[PDB]
């Protein structure tokens, strides 16, 4: 029932977590953030990365 990501849809497939504890989204679907395989190390979403 809960939704996530920039697409605001339910969880599905592989999800990646934003490493900014103050992130307003926290979890994203891999494809929505252009990922096929998980990146190494800490990762920050597009919303927290941009100005």
């Amino acid at each position: 029932e809960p939704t996530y990501c920039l697409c605001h849809q339910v969880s599905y497939g592989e999800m990646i977590g934003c490493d900014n504890p103050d992130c307003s989204i926290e979890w994203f679907h891999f494809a929505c953030v252009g990922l096929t395989t998980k990146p190494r190390g800490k990762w920050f979403c597009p919303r927290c990365s941009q100005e």
């Binding site: 999800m15 990646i16 998980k38 190494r40």
Partner: peptide, 8 residues
């Protein structure tokens, strides 16, 4: 990065 597979 931290990831998780959607549980069924």
């Amino acid at each position: 990065a931290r990831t998780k597979q959607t549980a069924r």
